[PDB]
């Protein structure tokens, strides 16, 4: 979720994703670790059997038949990590994530507590203000006239420069905000 996507996935990416998905579902079917190790080694052997096939039509046909095999043989209730998109704790803490701009609306009595925190916040705000034009300039110069082909962003190439469009990535609330 941090890397920019590409226009497509190559054959190698597709077969690797199939390998990982099939291994995860196999682990869902084989609850115990020794049985999982056995059948996962068998799965790896089955994948290695055609590791160096050079006929792209044949490789594509084999990958397609593998997909058809997986869809029929998938676990209807696969194991999901608790914070993964299908898990039981996927977006549980989103109600606690509060954007930092809300701090600007605190009453001065609220800001009277935490003086050091708000002095540091003022320094951060000044830093964000002072480097915006350089970041915009960098983006315009680097990008092609038609527009940007991909969502990849450039790093800071000078010394006193920050990477363009950094504020919202850096000031993410937290993963356990409260």
């Amino acid at each position: 979720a941090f890397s920019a996507p590409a226009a497509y996935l190559t054959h190698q990416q597709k077969v690797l994703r199939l390998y990982k998905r099939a291994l995860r579902h196999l682990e869902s079917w084989c609850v115990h670790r020794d049985k999982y190790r056995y059948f996962a080694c068998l799965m790896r052997a089955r994948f290695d059997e055609h590791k160096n096939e050079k006929d792209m039509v044949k490789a594509t046909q084999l990958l397609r038949q593998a997909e058809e095999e997986f869809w029929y043989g998938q676990h209807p209730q696969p194991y999901i990590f608790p914070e993964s998109p299908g898990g039981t704790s996927y977006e549980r803490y989103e109600c606690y994530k509060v954007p930092e701009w809300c701090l600007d609306d605190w009453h001065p009595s609220e800001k009277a507590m935490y003086p050091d925190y708000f002095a540091k916040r003022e320094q951060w705000k000044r830093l964000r203000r002072e480097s915006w034009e350089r970041e915009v300039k960098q983006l315009q110069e680097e990008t092609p006239p038609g527009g940007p082909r991909t969502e990849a962003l450039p790093p800071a190439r000078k010394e006193g420069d920050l990477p363009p469009l950094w504020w919202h990535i850096v000031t993410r609330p937290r993963e356990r905000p409260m």
Binding site: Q13, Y19, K51, E175
Partner: protein, 88 residues
């Protein structure tokens, strides 16, 4: 209370522990900055299993687009620290 405040050194220790428990990679040769392909001569299929082992170790799922890039233990440690908001 809940889980302790996991630190950077702990992440590195666990990553290297899991790697040293892999039969394909010998313990003495392995280094934090070692590339999984140039340094260890490991195939793409082999790399996927390391990523899954890291998921099982730390109990969270790394997306496939993010996962393929990780070629060094330091890269894995940095990714995990970025996800868990670990600053020391």
């Amino acid at each position: 209370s809940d889980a302790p405040p996991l630190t950077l050194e702990a992440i590195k220790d666990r990553v290297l522990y899991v790697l040293k428990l892999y039969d394909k990679i010998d313990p003495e040769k392995l280094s934090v900055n070692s590339h999984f392909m140039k340094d260890l001569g490991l195939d793409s299929l082999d790399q996927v299993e390391i990523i899954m082992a890291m998921e099982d170790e730390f109990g969270f799922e790394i997306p496939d687009i993010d996962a393929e890039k990780l070629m060094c233990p330091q890269e894995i440690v940095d990714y995990i620290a970025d996800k868990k908001d670990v600053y020391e």
